[PDB]
């Protein structure tokens, strides 16, 4: 089964999560795992001035999403929705929609926020779009034990992995957050192989 980890990141938090998701998915033998980012929509000069992070991941095309058995989408929140960059990219999948190209493929979502608020809404609003394409939606539930720990500030929900970046973006994804992300990658890839071989 082929598993695409497709993400948008400005300051690297989602990028770090995406690598963890891919690390989990890769544990599944017979899962072929690929990490790509959506295009930046900001002018390059404004991106740089804002202190955005340069990223090694190849830039995806909308069309190539059809090549995968499972797609795990990562996006930071923008006021409780996916980012404009991820939205713009998904708005370019009308050809895929019309051909039923993503129908029955697995979909799962992970997110990042500054201070936690909107992390659930970002994931479930993204599920809406996945459903229009007839993708099978994969939440993570409470298999990841870290979800029971309320001793430290941490992202992660039953809807999908998340990270808390801090108001000023200075936090890095924690061990527990990354664990949950790895689990989500393992679980989705396992399902993809179960379904598609």
């Amino acid at each position: 089964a082929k598993v695409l980890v497709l993400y948008y990141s400005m300051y690297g938090h989602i990028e770090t999560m995406a690598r963890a998701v891919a690390e989990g998915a890769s544990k599944v033998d017979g899962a072929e795992v690929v990490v790509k980012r959506v295009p930046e929509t900001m002018p390059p000069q404004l991106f740089e001035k804002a202190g955005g992070k340069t990223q090694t991941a190849p830039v995806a095309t909308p069309q190539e999403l059809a090549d995968y058995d499972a797609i795990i989408f990562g996006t930071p929140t923008r006021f409780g929705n996916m980012s404009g960059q991820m939205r713009t990219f998904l708005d370019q999948t009308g050809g895929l929609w019309a051909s039923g190209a993503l129908y029955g493929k697995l979909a799962s979502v992970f997110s990042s926020t500054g201070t936690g608020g909107g992390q659930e809404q970002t994931i479930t609003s993204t599920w809406t779009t996945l459903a229009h394409h007839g993708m099978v939606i994969v939440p993570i539930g409470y298999a990841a034990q870290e979800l029971f720990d309320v001793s430290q500030v941490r992202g992660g929900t039953p809807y999908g992995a998340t990270t808390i970046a801090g108001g000023d973006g200075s936090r890095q994804p924690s061990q527990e957050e990354l664990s949950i992300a790895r689990y989500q990658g393992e679980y989705v890839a396992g399902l993809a192989v179960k379904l598609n071989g």
Copy 2:
């Protein structure tokens, strides 16, 4: 694979839809299909005096949900949520949650409304609960061609089948609506057999 069509219906619109879902599911070789309703929560006298419909489907226990590979949940809307009956029943699945009993099982949802409003929100808000149980959520997308037909008033969404009961409850599920319902059962039962034999 074993498929439970689990529903609440007061006036029979969801009951009718549930039978169509079960019909569709039973078309799949290897699928064992069972239809049950959740308990009424209204006092029986008030149920009858409001004109509630007597139903032949047996009443489910929370515990028996563990026995199935796929559960297709049907509920009328109550102001854009699942009904109190369905909510009260799902509130009794804490034991199943604690044991991971529904984890990884397929889930899908169908709804009914008087005049359309809330039919999407009923489905997607039900998905939230399914996700807490770690169920794999199955939307129907646009595979059912009736979804393209805007020439007549018609339930059905990419999130799941729906029916429009009319303001006074006098409408009966239409052929197009029942077709989408059958498609949903068949599709989900197919996935269930693919995953579980």
Copy 3:
């Protein structure tokens, strides 16, 4: 203006929050503030055996909601929805709906969860029902400074105040959580007086 704080609580977390909300609302001169609970739906013997908390607040009727200019709803989560008790109560407001009795009245929501997951979904899914009644929906945004603090585990979202009860229910609402709850009460009551005098 008359402000109803209407809540459901099994173990007292929402009850504690509700009192804080009422404490905030009462700071607004010319706001008349009342706290009531929805009926328990569990058999009394099962409630007691589960270690449920007895509560002094009077039990509301559905009809009396019409008497208020603003209603602030509190409910614990059940898998990312409002509780069956709150759902059952709201399912009894069909008379109010048909008469437009809650139309244009202010609505706001607060929630409680064991470990955080579902706290956003509980609030926004509740908003759906409020919208069917034509209630004006009042989120709190980020006026409450505590929402910026990620140094300690704490509830509170831009959608409404929340508390984290812990997996075993042993946590009590924190100073920061209660502050946010008080703010929500103050803010809603201020709006109610602005609108209705």
Copy 4:
């Protein structure tokens, strides 16, 4: 009071609805109504070649939103979310967010879809973003009697006005749909004047 009808439209269906919203709002004595569109994000050549409609409304800046007492947002759906154009624009309101510039301002939403699916989710997912800004969210409920009419295919929800463009975009907003749109503008403008003079 000042009312901004802020919209995105590619083929004019939301543009038509926006004009009706503005018509309704202008009926309120004391309401100053302004209609503006968000910037196109598609390359101009691709916009034209796809048959995009030239529009007379001026393009808004993020900054000018601060000048209004009520903002009524219109967007077509993109797979059950707001359009990338509207998302990209709202993503540029971080400055306004940081200063509390939209806090306590009225907000309301209207949508358009090809065949109905996603019209509710578009509205409610837009509400999420409004809530992060602390805006007071205004659904329309069932005040508009057309919402009771299931005899013809018709947009409109208790969450806000909608229109059905048809699979091929050839439908024009109907009289019933435009009536609901006008009602929404009038209602929101009335609240704006009540609160702000």
